[PDB]
Amino acid sequence: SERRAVYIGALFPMSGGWPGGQACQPAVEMALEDVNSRRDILPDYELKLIHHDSKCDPGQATKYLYELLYNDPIKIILMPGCSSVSTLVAEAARMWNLIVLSYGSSSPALSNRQRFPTFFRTHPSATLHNPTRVKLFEKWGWKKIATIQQTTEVFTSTLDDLEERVKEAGIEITFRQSFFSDPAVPVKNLKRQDARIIVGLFYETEARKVFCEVYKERLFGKKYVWFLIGWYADNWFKIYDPSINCTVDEMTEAVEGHITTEIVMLNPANTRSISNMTSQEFVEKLTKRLKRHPEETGGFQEAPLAYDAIWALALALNKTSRLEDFNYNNQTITDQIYRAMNSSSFEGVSGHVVFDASGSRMAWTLIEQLQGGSYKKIGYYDSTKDDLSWSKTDKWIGGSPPADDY
Amino acid sequence: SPPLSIMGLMPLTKEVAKGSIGRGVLPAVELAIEQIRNESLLRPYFLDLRLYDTECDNAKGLKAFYDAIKYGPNHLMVFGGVCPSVTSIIAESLQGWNLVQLSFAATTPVLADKKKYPYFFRTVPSDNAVNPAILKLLKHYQWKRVGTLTQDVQRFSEVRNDLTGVLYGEDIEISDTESFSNDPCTSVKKLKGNDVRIILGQFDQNMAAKVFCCAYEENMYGSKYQWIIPGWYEPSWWEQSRCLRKNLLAAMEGYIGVDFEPLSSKQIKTISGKTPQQYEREYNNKRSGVGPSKFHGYAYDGIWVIAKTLQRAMETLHASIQDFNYTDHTLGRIILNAMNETNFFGVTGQVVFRNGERMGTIKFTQFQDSREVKVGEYNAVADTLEIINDTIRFQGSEPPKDD
Ligand SMILES: *[C@@H]1O[C@H](CO[C@@H]2O[C@@H](C)[C@@H](O)[C@@H](O)[C@@H]2O)[C@@H](O[C@@H]2O[C@H](CO)[C@@H](O[C@H]3O[C@H](CO[C@H]4O[C@H](CO)[C@@H](O)[C@H](O)[C@@H]4O)[C@@H](O)[C@H](O[C@H]4O[C@H](CO)[C@@H](O)[C@H](O)[C@@H]4O)[C@@H]3O)[C@H](O)[C@H]2NC(C)=O)[C@H](O)[C@H]1NC(C)=O
Ligand SMILES: *[C@@H]1O[C@H](CO[C@@H]2O[C@@H](C)[C@@H](O)[C@@H](O)[C@@H]2O)[C@@H](O[C@@H]2O[C@H](CO)[C@@H](O[C@H]3O[C@H](CO)[C@@H](O)[C@H](O)[C@@H]3O)[C@H](O)[C@H]2NC(C)=O)[C@H](O)[C@H]1NC(C)=O
Ligand SMILES: NC[C@](O)(CS(=O)(=O)O)c1ccc(Cl)cc1
Numbered sequence: 138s139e140r141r142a143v144y145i146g147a148l149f150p151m152s153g154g155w156p157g158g159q160a161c162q163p164a165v166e167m168a169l170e171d172v173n174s175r176r177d178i179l180p181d182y183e184l185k186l187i188h189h190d191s192k193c194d195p196g197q198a199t200k201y202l203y204e205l206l207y208n209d210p211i212k213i214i215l216m217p218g219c220s221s222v223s224t225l226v227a228e229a230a231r232m233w234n235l236i237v238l239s240y241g242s243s244s245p246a247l248s249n250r251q252r253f254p255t256f257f258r259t260h261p262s263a264t265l266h267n268p269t270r271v272k273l274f275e276k277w278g279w280k281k282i283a284t285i286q287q288t289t290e291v292f293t294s295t296l297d298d299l300e301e302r303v304k305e306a307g308i309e310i311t312f313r314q315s316f317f318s319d320p321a322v323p324v325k326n327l328k329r330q331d332a333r334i335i336v337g338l339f340y341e342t343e344a345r346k347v348f349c350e351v352y353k354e355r356l357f358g359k360k361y362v363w364f365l366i367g368w369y370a371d372n373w374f375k376i377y378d379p380s381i382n383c384t385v386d387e388m389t390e391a392v393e394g395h396i397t398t399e400i401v402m403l404n405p406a407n408t409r410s411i412s413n414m415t416s417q418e419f420v421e422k423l424t425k426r427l428k429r430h431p432e433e434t435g436g437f438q439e440a441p442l443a444y445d446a447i448w449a450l451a452l453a454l455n456k457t458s459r460l461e462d463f464n465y466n467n468q469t470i471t472d473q474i475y476r477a478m479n480s481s482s483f484e485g486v487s488g489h490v491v492f493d494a495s496g497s498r499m500a501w502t503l504i505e506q507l508q509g510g511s512y513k514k515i516g517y518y519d520s521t522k523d524d525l526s527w528s529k530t531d532k533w534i535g536g537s538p539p540a541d542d543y
Numbered sequence: 544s545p546p547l548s549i550m551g552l553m554p555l556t557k558e559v560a561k562g563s564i565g566r567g568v569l570p571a572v573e574l575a576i577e578q579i580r581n582e583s584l585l586r587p588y589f590l591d592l593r594l595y596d597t598e599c600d601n602a603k604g605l606k607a608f609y610d611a612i613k614y615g616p617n618h619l620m621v622f623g624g625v626c627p628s629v630t631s632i633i634a635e636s637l638q639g640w641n642l643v644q645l646s647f648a649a650t651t652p653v654l655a656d657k658k659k660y661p662y663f664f665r666t667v668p669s670d671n672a673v674n675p676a677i678l679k680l681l682k683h684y685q686w687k688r689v690g691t692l693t694q695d696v697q698r699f700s701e702v703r704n705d706l707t708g709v710l711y712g713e714d715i716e717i718s719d720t721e722s723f724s725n726d727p728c729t730s731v732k733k734l735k736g737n738d739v740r741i742i743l744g745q746f747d748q749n750m751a752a753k754v755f756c757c758a759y760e761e762n763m764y765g766s767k768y769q770w771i772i773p774g775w776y777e778p779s780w781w782e783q784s785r786c787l788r789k790n791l792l793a794a795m796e797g798y799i800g801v802d803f804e805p806l807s808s809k810q811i812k813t814i815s816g817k818t819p820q821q822y823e824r825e826y827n828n829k830r831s832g833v834g835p836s837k838f839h840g841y842a843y844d845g846i847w848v849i850a851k852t853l854q855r856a857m858e859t860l861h862a863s864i865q866d867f868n869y870t871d872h873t874l875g876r877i878i879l880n881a882m883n884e885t886n887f888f889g890v891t892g893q894v895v896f897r898n899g900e901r902m903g904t905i906k907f908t909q910f911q912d913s914r915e916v917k918v919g920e921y922n923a924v925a926d927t928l929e930i931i932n933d934t935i936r937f938q939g940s941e942p943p944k945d946d
């Protein structure tokens with residue numbers, strides 16, 4: 138007979154704070170072609186896309202969410218990208234019994250089943266850095282940690298999660314300092330209580346300000362280890378900032394030896410995943426559909442998560458299969474898709490795809506250290522299987538990592 | 544009589560606690576709608592208010608709004624938005640349907656951001672509107688040095704944050720800034736130790752009883768101290784662990800409470816031809832068994848703002864309305880421009896907006912033996928303070944000094 142059309146209502150940020158839809162929409166289009174051309178996944182169903190440009194704006198997204206829900210055809214799932222767009226659609230979704238699957242939202246707040254009961258994300262939460270941090274603290278035998286953050290909900294939530302994770306490992310947070318824009322008084326305070334192991338959470342502009350202030354107070358050297366986020370631009374510390382007094386040399390000096398954690402978004406292995414593509418082939422195939430270069434295209438590094446989200450849905454819809462009967466007033470099919478989505482376990486272009494109880498993606502983390510003004514891969518950590526890959530590439534002045542104490 | 548449809552959005556259900564604001568204001572709304580029709584003020588048209596229940600919930604509220612657009616008549620504007628998170632969602636999206644919104648109860652300062660909420664207006668002053676009033680009070684009593692005590696909850700930290708800008712370029716020093724989450728006693732100890740005399744408090748009713756208990760224990764009360772705290776607490780709130788009731792009342796004695804003025808005290812005829820006193824009587828008869836709400840005057844004046852806006856928008860069109868779909872950007876812009884012209888004497892005083900924000904009246908109260916008593920008002924339009932002679936009092940021969 139005929140394959141029944143089954144619809145996804147997606148929102149792609151083509152502009153805004155995170156213009157991730159630029160590469161994620163083509164990656165979504167490619168994944169649908171790959172799933173629909175597979176006779177073994179949904180033989181009786183054809184998965185189709187209906188999308189709108191959210192502009193990474195919740196106000197804008199409210200207009201398109203209406204457009205998706207109040208116009209035929211009925212959609213079985215909603216796929217937002219930006220964290221602010223997901224916070225709005227994932228909360229609203231229960232009124233239309235809709236599963237919500239995000240390909241780009243990292244906000245820790247989205248891992249709340251009370252506010253977001255049908256929510257899943259192939260993009261991990263910013264809290265995924267915390268198990269890697271506690272493991273590195275354990276490896277190097279540290280139990281006294283200082284934390285410094287910029288005043289943002291994401292950074293406060295990340296540190297709130299780090300508090301409960303260190304308590305479990307018999308580790309404590311000595312000092313916690315915050316700053317809206319100027320980090321002069323928080324860094325001066327770290328020096329005063331003689332903090333040794335510091336977890337610093339801030340954006341790049343604020344990192345430059347933190348590390349200039351770190352040079353001045355000599356909060357770098359053999360004594361100190363800084364744990365930062367690994368998503369900053371290459372040579373961020375060398376970038377010219379007129380509001381910073383420190384020189385390139387001074388700040389290449391201040392950042393020396395610091396550790397970074399970064400969520401793995403593309404499998405570094407040359408293995409073939411469920412689609413039978415390799416990471417390298419996915420990248421080459423994606424580069425071909427793009428109008429501009431990967432460097433110019435927003436959401437290029439997140440594009441494999443968007444590709445994997447379509448596969449997670451396809452495989453979940455495959456496990457259940459009466460999809461045309463879906464209506465916004467019925468929980469039946471939703472709860473069955475929810476159960477199938479919750480039981481996700483497959484190999485995607487981003488690596489192994491699994492969700493925790495909150496619907497947040499579980500993934501590997503890349504651990505790097507800045508050695509001689511350049512980041513060097515010192516290993517990877519898999520939080521779900523407590524698997525640490527050590528490179529034996531890390532370097533310390535003492536010939537060994539220092540300690541939390543005087 | 545073609546209808547001019549208005550989308551009324553508010554919690555109306557008994558199952559929702561804020562449902563009392565929505566129901567409390569409906570008799571005031573009915574009185575304004577009645578007079579406008581009875582007097583045919585918008586002839587040929589009649590003001591058609593449709594009501595949709597938000598249930599003070601983000602999801603139910605958004606669906607109520609979506610269901611109003613889908614199945615309801617063509618609304619020209621939005622009237623309501625009570626709960627802060629629901630109002631923020633609706634207010635942010637307004638341009639998508641070219642809908643101007645007028646709220647009578649959402650006081651969250653967040654909504655003053657016209658980059659995020661350009662189509663949003665409110666007849667009620669925001670939580671931050673107490674700050675230019677407090678500046679006037681400090682200037683009046685020559686208080687040049689203050690300390691702050693704030694609860695670490697967004698509703699209060701937003702007010703404290705705004706105070707910084709209000710007191711900048713003025714001759715007033717914030718000598719000590721103290722915050723607390725659950726217990727204010729450590730923060731009250733620091734203020735005492737820094738010899739603070741004038742305290743600007745921003746915390747809830749539950750925390751207020753704790754604050755004044757710590758104040759008694761630290762002797763941060765009497766002739767040398769002045770506490771300036773929220774004026775919106777339930778009456779007899781203090782009656783509702785270590786301190787005694789007599790010791791709480793001793794420390795509370797003379798605190799200044801600050802909040803918006805529910806209705807004008809001026810015995811002058813408003814736009815409807817009634818004085819605020821005559822309106823208040825008409826509202827109390829109309830409400831019957833429904834519990835009164837302090838936002839009733841704001842809802843009443845809110846309907847008059849809509850009627851006046853529509854009259855002016857009708858004049859603008861006549862110079863060069865049924866055709867309005869949520870598509871007409873130009874009609875929405877006309878409605879927006881006409882609302883910005885609002886200038887009339889309402890039951891809540893003069894109704895004027897400064898960038899969608901109400902310029903209104905702030906009430907000053909003083910706790911005297913058993914209750915809060917009115918001691919003054921601040922007029923935001925004129926930026927003036929009027930202190931009620933023979934009401935405000937101090938335990939010493941002079942008001943306290945700031946050091
Ligand atoms: C998952 O991935 C790879 C993908 O293959 C390549 O990569 C893509 C990105 C594209 O660039 C593709 O065009 C490209 O193929 C799949 O692996 C290949 O798939 C087939 C599966 O059998 C293989 O094709 C031939 O295999 C044998 C023998 O091939 C010989 O030659 C190569 C060098 O050229 C040697 O290295 C091999 O060891 C071997 O000696 C051949 O007999 C078949 O030919 C035909 O024979 C009949 C004759 O009567 C015909 O009637 C039929 O047409 C029959 O097919 C195949 O042509 C191919 O070599 C491998 N390649 C690799 C790299 O392993 C893999 O199958 C796919 N998995 C899926 C789809 O599930
Ligand atoms: C939105 O309203 C603003 C305020 O309008 C004023 O107050 C209303 C309550 C109502 O009474 C209305 O009629 C008033 O005009 C508008 O800003 C004001 O608009 C004027 C510009 O047209 C400006 O005035 C000038 O008038 C002369 C010009 O030489 C001078 O005497 C005076 O110094 C002013 O420059 C006025 O200053 C300005 N108001 C404020 C407080 O800044 C605003 O344009 C309007 N926008 C619309 C309708 O789209
Ligand atoms: N990786 C994409 C995204 O998670 C998108 S968002 O969650 O911030 O909307 C993101 C995360 C952190 C930063 Cl700095 C920018 C973007």
Ligand SMILES: *[C@@H]1O[C@H](CO)[C@@H](O)[C@H](O)[C@H]1NC(C)=O
Binds near residue numbers: 177452455456
């Ligand atoms: C899809 O579901 C069918 C139903 O049993 C199963 O046979 C098939 O292997 C599934 N496909 C994948 C790729 O898991």
